[PDB]
Motif scaffolding. Structure first.
Motif, PDB file in Angstrom:
ATOM      1  N   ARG A  20       0.830  -1.189   0.000  1.00 53.51           N
ATOM      2  CA  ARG A  20       0.000   0.000   0.000  1.00 53.51           C
ATOM      3  C   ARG A  20       0.861   1.233   0.000  1.00 53.51           C
ATOM      4  O   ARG A  20       0.870   2.023  -0.959  1.00 53.51           O
ATOM      5  CB  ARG A  20      -0.831   0.028   1.272  1.00 53.51           C
ATOM      6  CG  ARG A  20      -2.125  -0.741   1.202  1.00 53.51           C
ATOM      7  CD  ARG A  20      -3.225   0.099   0.590  1.00 53.51           C
ATOM      8  NE  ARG A  20      -3.162   1.488   1.057  1.00 53.51           N
ATOM      9  CZ  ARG A  20      -3.819   1.946   2.132  1.00 53.51           C
ATOM     10  NH1 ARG A  20      -4.604   1.128   2.874  1.00 53.51           N
ATOM     11  NH2 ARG A  20      -3.691   3.234   2.468  1.00 53.51           N
ATOM     12  N   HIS A  55      -5.123  -3.611 -10.350  1.00 51.58           N
ATOM     13  CA  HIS A  55      -5.035  -4.326  -9.079  1.00 51.58           C
ATOM     14  C   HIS A  55      -4.629  -3.349  -7.970  1.00 51.58           C
ATOM     15  O   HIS A  55      -5.141  -3.409  -6.847  1.00 51.58           O
ATOM     16  CB  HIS A  55      -4.084  -5.534  -9.175  1.00 51.58           C
ATOM     17  CG  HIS A  55      -2.638  -5.165  -9.360  1.00 51.58           C
ATOM     18  ND1 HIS A  55      -1.647  -5.568  -8.475  1.00 51.58           N
ATOM     19  CD2 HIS A  55      -2.020  -4.414 -10.321  1.00 51.58           C
ATOM     20  CE1 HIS A  55      -0.479  -5.089  -8.884  1.00 51.58           C
ATOM     21  NE2 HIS A  55      -0.678  -4.384 -10.002  1.00 51.58           N
ATOM     22  N   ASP A  61      -7.557  -1.725  -6.886  1.00 48.37           N
ATOM     23  CA  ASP A  61      -8.294  -2.735  -6.141  1.00 48.37           C
ATOM     24  C   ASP A  61      -7.816  -2.857  -4.696  1.00 48.37           C
ATOM     25  O   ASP A  61      -8.641  -2.888  -3.780  1.00 48.37           O
ATOM     26  CB  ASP A  61      -8.241  -4.067  -6.887  1.00 48.37           C
ATOM     27  CG  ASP A  61      -8.947  -4.008  -8.248  1.00 48.37           C
ATOM     28  OD1 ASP A  61      -9.560  -2.958  -8.568  1.00 48.37           O
ATOM     29  OD2 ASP A  61      -8.901  -5.021  -9.003  1.00 48.37           O
ATOM     30  N   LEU A  62      -6.495  -2.876  -4.496  1.00 50.22           N
ATOM     31  CA  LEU A  62      -5.899  -2.949  -3.157  1.00 50.22           C
ATOM     32  C   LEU A  62      -6.375  -1.753  -2.341  1.00 50.22           C
ATOM     33  O   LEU A  62      -6.803  -1.888  -1.191  1.00 50.22           O
ATOM     34  CB  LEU A  62      -4.366  -2.931  -3.268  1.00 50.22           C
ATOM     35  CG  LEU A  62      -3.339  -3.388  -2.195  1.00 50.22           C
ATOM     36  CD1 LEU A  62      -3.884  -3.274  -0.774  1.00 50.22           C
ATOM     37  CD2 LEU A  62      -2.872  -4.831  -2.453  1.00 50.22           C
ATOM     38  N   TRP A  91      -9.020   0.332  -2.734  1.00 51.74           N
ATOM     39  CA  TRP A  91     -10.438   0.338  -2.414  1.00 51.74           C
ATOM     40  C   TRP A  91     -10.745  -0.642  -1.285  1.00 51.74           C
ATOM     41  O   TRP A  91     -11.498  -0.322  -0.367  1.00 51.74           O
ATOM     42  CB  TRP A  91     -11.259   0.022  -3.652  1.00 51.74           C
ATOM     43  CG  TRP A  91     -12.672  -0.097  -3.328  1.00 51.74           C
ATOM     44  CD1 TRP A  91     -13.364  -1.245  -3.162  1.00 51.74           C
ATOM     45  CD2 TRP A  91     -13.586   0.973  -3.064  1.00 51.74           C
ATOM     46  NE1 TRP A  91     -14.663  -0.975  -2.831  1.00 51.74           N
ATOM     47  CE2 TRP A  91     -14.832   0.382  -2.767  1.00 51.74           C
ATOM     48  CE3 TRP A  91     -13.478   2.372  -3.065  1.00 51.74           C
ATOM     49  CZ2 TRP A  91     -15.968   1.136  -2.469  1.00 51.74           C
ATOM     50  CZ3 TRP A  91     -14.610   3.126  -2.772  1.00 51.74           C
ATOM     51  CH2 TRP A  91     -15.838   2.506  -2.478  1.00 51.74           C
ATOM     52  N   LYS A  92     -10.130  -1.821  -1.371  1.00 55.96           N
ATOM     53  CA  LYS A  92     -10.205  -2.875  -0.362  1.00 55.96           C
ATOM     54  C   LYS A  92      -9.764  -2.399   1.027  1.00 55.96           C
ATOM     55  O   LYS A  92     -10.253  -2.904   2.045  1.00 55.96           O
ATOM     56  CB  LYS A  92      -9.356  -4.059  -0.824  1.00 55.96           C
ATOM     57  CG  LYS A  92      -9.006  -5.089   0.231  1.00 55.96           C
ATOM     58  CD  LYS A  92     -10.006  -6.252   0.337  1.00 55.96           C
ATOM     59  CE  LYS A  92      -9.248  -7.549   0.737  1.00 55.96           C
ATOM     60  NZ  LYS A  92      -9.999  -8.565   1.570  1.00 55.96           N
ATOM     61  N   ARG A 111      -9.957   0.763   2.280  1.00 55.26           N
ATOM     62  CA  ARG A 111     -10.459   2.144   2.453  1.00 55.26           C
ATOM     63  C   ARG A 111     -10.576   2.619   3.921  1.00 55.26           C
ATOM     64  O   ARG A 111     -10.327   3.788   4.225  1.00 55.26           O
ATOM     65  CB  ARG A 111     -11.754   2.382   1.654  1.00 55.26           C
ATOM     66  CG  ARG A 111     -12.852   1.389   1.973  1.00 55.26           C
ATOM     67  CD  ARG A 111     -14.041   1.554   1.047  1.00 55.26           C
ATOM     68  NE  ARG A 111     -15.151   0.658   1.381  1.00 55.26           N
ATOM     69  CZ  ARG A 111     -15.238  -0.615   0.988  1.00 55.26           C
ATOM     70  NH1 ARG A 111     -14.274  -1.171   0.252  1.00 55.26           N
ATOM     71  NH2 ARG A 111     -16.295  -1.336   1.337  1.00 55.26           N
ATOM     72  N   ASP A 151     -20.998   1.430  -4.092  1.00 54.89           N
ATOM     73  CA  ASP A 151     -19.615   1.852  -3.796  1.00 54.89           C
ATOM     74  C   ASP A 151     -19.520   3.334  -3.447  1.00 54.89           C
ATOM     75  O   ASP A 151     -18.691   3.737  -2.632  1.00 54.89           O
ATOM     76  CB  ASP A 151     -18.660   1.507  -4.967  1.00 54.89           C
ATOM     77  CG  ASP A 151     -18.631  -0.012  -5.290  1.00 54.89           C
ATOM     78  OD1 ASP A 151     -19.697  -0.647  -5.223  1.00 54.89           O
ATOM     79  OD2 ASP A 151     -17.555  -0.576  -5.612  1.00 54.89           O
TER      80      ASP A 151
END
Ligand SMILES: CC(C)n1nc(C#Cc2cccnc2)c2c(N)ncnc21
Length: 822
Positions: A320, A330, A333-334, A336-337, A339, A364
């Motif tokens: 991160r 991706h 994606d990381l 958003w996962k 947040r 979302d």
């Protein structure tokens, strides 16, 4: 009286109030009534402020970002005055204590009851600050002049105060019927439509069946969009383009899918189009007002049933670090996962998380907002990023203003230009930014002054006339008195335009001497003497323009024939001798941006203790290709000095000596060294500022020098490289830096130090400049249109490196510049 005030507003803002009524538009109607309320409440609050708070409102302190001095003080009523010696460290109260003591002895006999006014100026000294913290006490020390002040009692200030008194359900794909148009052209026509949320598409851009260039066209076709209607975000924007093909753009038009009442739009619409330069998300969402001439497109938003965007409570219900400082799928994606972790540990990455959320999926957006709703406030720097068009959501925008309320007035002033431009991105008339700007402007008259002019100066632009018109009216409702003060400025500007047109005609038929004499007669007419005298300067309201000196006024002989207008004031003395230039025919917006950014550099430099002796003179667009520039007295062009005329003190054996002789002539004996030093410092500032900004075409006609030694630039119309402009060292300046010697690396290298410090300081604030230019893209300046321009700044500040690299980089260029120098 209520009639009188309306007509004064109409005249002032350059739009008749009746035009607002005739539109018979509810949104406009509501904006008007709510804002009038808000503004009148403000005015009420003002007319009961304490006297110190009033001063704070009307004459905000002008501060700088041991030793003694002479100062002259006198009381409001009388001529007699005293000249004290004090310390630059002393408080104003200490000074007031001397004055009063002095009056008590002559006039045969409480500091806190007073403020000190700067003679002949709307400027005051008060507060717990050493005297030299005051911009005017500073100015005085550098220029050498004895500060001249007047003791003003609280009961006089209060007299001034007194005199100035006044839904989820719908899952079928979204669609619209395209009915017909009425345009002009050569070939077949197509309409392209795409849905946007900011810069981002919310799905692919579905197009028209082609029809012949005939009509007045007729389509009557369902265009069906690749997204569910329960997935349209609150700030959804539908964008059309009409063009022709066998590629020729013709027109565009945009509209919000929800009205200003959060209700979704139905059934049919007529779209009055803007002519084209295909799709324009950033383009205003209001139709072309020239409904006579505009090509027009009728479409039909199907009634899906009243449906409103659901309330917030409803919304509230529903490797991160390594990357985190453009990103792959991706990676996004990381993010958003993670947040909640973003929220909890990196609140300053809000924007990056916002750019990864799926604005075309309602769930979302709900999740995101939930997080945004408990999100700690951000630093001003991050808030400025969030006002970008990449963040169209009104809850985001809301948060952003929220984080901006902590702006100081001085800061707000520094970014005001950009904030006004951001109003152009706004989707509805009643919005947080507008309320914020109006509230700060009603609480600070300097803010109020420049807001007004930023708006007024754009009235000739159909796309913003309504919005800005409405804002100015509201302001005026809030300050009746200031409205009059502003009218007095508009009247002066009306007369200058007239006088300027005369001069342009005259000078094509006659000699300059003759035209000048005619200008003077014109000016001497009662109506002009009256209109042009006794006003607050639009360039700086704290500057009083008292009596115009006709004999001194003239015009410059370059194209637009700018007017040169001098003034004087008995009460202000030397400091009353001031000049303004009026120019009609050029776009001044460019120069104003450039000047404001150099001003910003000077502020950042002074904040780390570097004073490069900059000359941040005023430039203020006022109207259509019309504005004023502040006169810098006691200055001349390099070119003019380099004319190396006989019979002058500066006469040289070799032209390379001209500029240095001139400096000698103005600064005899021991004064010379300080001048050479002012030159050196300012040279460094301007070389860095032009290099960073990509301002090219510098030459001896547009560089000026002050008799103190200070060098500065005039007439920038080219920047961000818009001819990669190299660093520029000019031999003749280098020669002045080296004290006339062929070789002098002590001096020259100090000079290199100055440039290097200035350049490094600016890099540490590179993000500030980036954010500010980003917002400026809203202005429509032809040299600020796309990413390549912002990229120019990226490259110039070498922001992608470590300090060590960028300096090495800089050094090569600087060296390359020297080599170029003869
Ligand atoms: C003497 C003349 C070249 N000149 N031109 C001036 C100018 C200018 C200007 C600024 C922006 C856009 N266009 C012209 C000027 C000034 N401001 N102060 C003193 N002298 C000035």
């Amino acid at each position: 009286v209520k009639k009188l005030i309306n007509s004064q507003i109409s005249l002032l803002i350059g739009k008749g109030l009746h035009e607002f009524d005739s539109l018979r538009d509810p949104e406009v109607n509501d904006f008007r009534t709510k804002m009038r309320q808000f503004c009148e409440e403000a005015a009420a609050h003002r007319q009961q402020l304490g006297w110190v708070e009033w001063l704070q409102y009307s004459f905000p302190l002008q501060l700088e970002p041991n030793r003694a001095l002479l100062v002259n003080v006198k009381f409001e009523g009388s001529e007699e005055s005293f000249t004290f010696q004090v310390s630059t460290k002393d408080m104003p109260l200490a000074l007031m204590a001397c004055a009063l003591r002095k009056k008590a002895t002559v006039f045969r006999q409480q500091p806190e009851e007073y403020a000190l006014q700067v003679n002949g100026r709307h400027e005051y000294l008060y507060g717990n600050y050493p005297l030299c913290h005051f911009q005017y006490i500073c100015s005085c020390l550098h220029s050498g002049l004895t500060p001249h002040l007047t003791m003003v009692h609280s009961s006089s200030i209060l007299a001034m105060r007194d005199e100035q008194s006044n839904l989820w359900s719908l899952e079928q794909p979204f669609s619209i019927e395209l009915i017909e148009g009425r345009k002009v052209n050569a070939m077949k026509l197509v309409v392209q439509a795409g849905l946007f949320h900011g810069n981002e598409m919310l799905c692919k851009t579905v197009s028209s069946s082609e029809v012949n260039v005939c009509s007045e066209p007729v389509w009557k076709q369902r265009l069906e969009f690749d997204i569910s209607v329960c997935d349209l975000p609150r700030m959804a924007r539908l964008c059309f383009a009409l063009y022709a093909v066998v590629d020729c753009p013709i027109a565009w038009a945009n509209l919000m899918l929800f009205d200003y009442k959060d209700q979704l739009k139905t059934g049919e619409r007529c779209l009055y189009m803007w002519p084209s330069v295909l799709l324009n998300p950033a383009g205003t969402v209001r139709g072309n007002p020239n409904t006579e001439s505009a090509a027009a497109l009728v479409i039909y938003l199907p009634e899906v049933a009243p449906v409103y965007f659901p309330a917030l409570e409803k919304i509230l219900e529903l490797l991160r670090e390594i990357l985190e400082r453009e990103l792959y799928e991706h990676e996004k994606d990381l993010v958003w996962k993670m947040r909640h972790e973003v929220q909890e540990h990196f609140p300053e990455a809000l924007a990056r998380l916002l750019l990864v959320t799926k604005w075309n999926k309602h769930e979302d957006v709900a999740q995101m907002l939930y997080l945004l709703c408990s999100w700690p406030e951000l630093p001003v720097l991050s808030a400025l990023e969030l006002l970008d068009f990449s963040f169209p959501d009104c809850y985001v925008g809301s948060f952003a203003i929220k984080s901006l309320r902590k702006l100081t007035d001085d800061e707000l002033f520094q970014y005001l230009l950009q904030l006004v431009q951001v109003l152009k991105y706004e989707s509805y008339l009643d919005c947080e930014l507008t309320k914020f700007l109006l509230g700060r402007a009603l609480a600070n008259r300097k803010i109020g002054h420049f807001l007004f002019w930023h708006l007024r100066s754009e009235m000739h632009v159909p796309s913003v006339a309504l919005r800005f018109g409405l804002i100015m009216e509201a302001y005026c409702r809030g300050s009746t008195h200031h409205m009059k003060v502003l009218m007095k400025q508009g009247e002066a500007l009306s007369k200058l335009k007239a006088l300027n047109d005369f001069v342009k005609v005259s000078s094509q038929k006659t000699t300059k001497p003759q035209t000048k004499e005619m200008m003077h007669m014109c000016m001497r007419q009662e109506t002009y003497m009256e209109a042009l005298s006794h006003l607050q300067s639009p360039l700086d309201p704290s500057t009083l323009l008292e009596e115009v000196c006709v004999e001194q006024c003239t015009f410059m002989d370059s194209k637009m024939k700018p007017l040169w207008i001098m003034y004087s004031s008995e009460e202000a003395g030397s400091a009353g001798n001031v000049g303004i230039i009026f120019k009609n025919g050029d776009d001044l917006r460019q120069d104003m941006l450039t000047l404001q950014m150099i001003q910003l550099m000077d502020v950042l430099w002074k904040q780390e203790g570097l004073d490069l002796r900059m000359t941040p003179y005023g430039c203020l667009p006022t109207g259509d290709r019309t504005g004023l520039i502040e006169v810098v007295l006691h200055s001349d062009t390099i070119a003019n000095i380099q004319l190396n005329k006989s019979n002058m003190a500066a006469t040289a054996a070799f032209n390379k000596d001209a500029l240095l002789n001139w400096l000698k002539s103005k600064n005899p004996g021991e004064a010379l060294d300080r001048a050479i030093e002012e030159f050196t410092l300012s040279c460094a500032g301007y070389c860095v500022a032009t290099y960073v900004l990509g301002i090219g075409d510098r030459h001896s006609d547009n560089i000026m020098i002050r008799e103190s030694g200070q060098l500065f630039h005039i007439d920038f119309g080219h920047f961000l490289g818009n001819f990669r402009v190299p660093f520029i060292l000019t031999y003749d300046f280098v020669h002045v830096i080296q004290q006339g010697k062929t070789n002098n690396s002590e001096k020259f290298e100090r000079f290199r130090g100055y440039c290097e410090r200035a350049y490094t300081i600016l890099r540490r604030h590179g993000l500030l400049f980036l954010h500010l230019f980003a917002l400026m893209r809203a202005a429509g300046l032809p040299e600020l249109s796309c990413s390549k321009d912002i990229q120019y700044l990226k490259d110039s500040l070498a922001l992608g490196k470590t300090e060590e690299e960028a300096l090495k980089h800089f050094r090569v260029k600087f060296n390359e510049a020297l080599r170029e120098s003869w």
